[PDB]
């Protein structure tokens, strides 16, 4: 019995953005939080206070509410997952397991499609604010004498914040999880010799196929969380100019804000995927204990 399916994400059609079920649903919202801190050090862009208090939160509420619209679509997929993962409750109606599988992907892709499409105007607002941000940075009076103290100051704060999260623990865990998961995949394939009946092994293979999706999700965020860590440190160990042009300071703020927001985003997803992978490991093993009892 899967009780929460918050591990389903959706990307835009051109793949620039990534929607998640957990707040704030976009790493773009965490960038907007970061830029709040940058505006504190610049008096000429003091209006970002009102941008953040009003427009960014109004985007977050509309994000959360447009997510809530997919609620019925979410449990429709959730109702199919529980049928396919539990042999006893698959027996409560006769539909070809293959047909029920096709219904699962229909409803799934329908549900994931709901996440994207009902958030079309919210990505429009992420784009607006981003353009709104860059127009506001024009009000900095420096033109080529722009100070990089803020930039390198925030880098120092990030590096301390990157120490807090246990990357190695997350990394060690997935290496063991994937290594054993593939072993169960090879085992089931090799052992269906002795199994006369497939419905409980079909439930095993379904959970294993959903275990693959979450693993890849886990590796994507882990790979992008490492990427953020590595490249901000790469900025902290390189040349440190103290002055730069106005347009390159915009790039600068957008760079570190991006890397940190993505990191905060990955941190939010890895904790959830970690739970999801453990929970699916209990359902699989219960069916394995189910499978072996029927071997007699």
């Amino acid at each position, epitope marked *: 019995t899967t009780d929460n399916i918050d591990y389903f994400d959706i990307s835009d059609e051109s793949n620039y953005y990534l929607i998640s079920q957990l707040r704030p649903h976009f790493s773009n919202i965490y960038f907007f939080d970061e830029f709040k801190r940058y505006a504190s050090y610049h008096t*000429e862009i003091k*209006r970002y206070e*009102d*941008i953040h*208090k*009003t*427009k960014v939160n*109004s985007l977050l509420n509309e994000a959360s509410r447009a997510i809530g619209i997919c609620n019925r679509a979410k449990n429709t997929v959730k109702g199919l997952i529980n049928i396919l993962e539990n042999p006893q409750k698959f027996k409560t109606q006769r539909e070809s397991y293959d047909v029920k599988l096709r219904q699962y992907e229909e409803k799934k892709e329908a549900f994931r499609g709901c996440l994207l499409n009902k958030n079309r105007k919210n990505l429009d607002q992420i784009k*607006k604010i981003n353009n*709104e941000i860059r*127009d*506001l940075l*024009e*009000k*900095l*009076k*420096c*033109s080529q004498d722009c100070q990089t103290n803020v930039y390198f100051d925030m880098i120092k704060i990030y590096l301390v914040d990157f120490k807090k999260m246990p990357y190695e623990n997350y990394d060690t865990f997935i290496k063991q999880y994937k290594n054993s998961y593939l072993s169960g995949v090879d085992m089931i394939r090799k052992i269906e010799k002795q199994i006369d009946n497939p419905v409980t092994i079909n439930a095993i293979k379904f959970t294993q196929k959903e275990m693959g999706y979450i693993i890849d999700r886990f590796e994507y965020h882990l790979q992008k969380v490492k990427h953020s860590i590595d490249q901000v440190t790469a900025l902290s160990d390189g040349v440190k100019p103290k002055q730069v042009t106005k347009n390159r300071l915009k790039e600068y703020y957008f760079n570190i804000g991006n890397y940190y927001s993505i990191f905060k985003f990955g941190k939010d997803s890895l904790n959830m995927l970690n739970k999801a992978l453990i929970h699916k490991e209990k359902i699989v093993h219960n069916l394995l204990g189910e499978l072996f009892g029927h071997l007699e």
Partner: antibody
Amino acid sequence: EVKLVESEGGLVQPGSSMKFSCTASGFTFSDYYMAWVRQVPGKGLEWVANINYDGSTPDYLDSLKSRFIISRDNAKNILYLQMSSLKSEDTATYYCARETVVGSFDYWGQGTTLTVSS
Amino acid sequence: GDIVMTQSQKFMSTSVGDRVSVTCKASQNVGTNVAWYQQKPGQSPKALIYSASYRYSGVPDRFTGSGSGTDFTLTINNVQSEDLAYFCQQYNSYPYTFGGGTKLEIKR
């Protein structure tokens, strides 16, 4: 495309009051600062006041912070400028203007004439 | 309290084919925070350029903006009879302030 339509203007005696309004269409009212600008016929422009997105912080020209109130109704997409204790110096054509993130005025209404006279 | 934008020239003589630059002086350094407006006879002002140099969409490319710091200039290529007044505006600090305006005085 973007339309700013100001209420009818009028003639007022010194000391009385008049409230102007401005209805906005063709853009998300709540996404922009809005402002009022006044111009004496044949003369230059003068900024009067402006209002932020939710209407929490209005700001004015110091001389008029006393007598002028700017307000917004985001649900009805209308900007208001309430004036009190008016004088002859206040006679002008008042423009409803949409303010940029920086402080520019991207779009202007057609103006509404206020005449202060006995 | 005070920033003054000065358009010292109230009228500027020109011809229809010409290209003319209109100047606006700021009392202090306002960086790039300058915008340019036109006002034809009997019309509300219309925006042309912001950030001293950036042209709004749909504004003809015969309008160009230059300047930084305290001296800003609007350039109007291929003058037309329909052209008249031009106002500069600073949005660096409150209160916002406009220049006195400059009108083209065409010779025929």
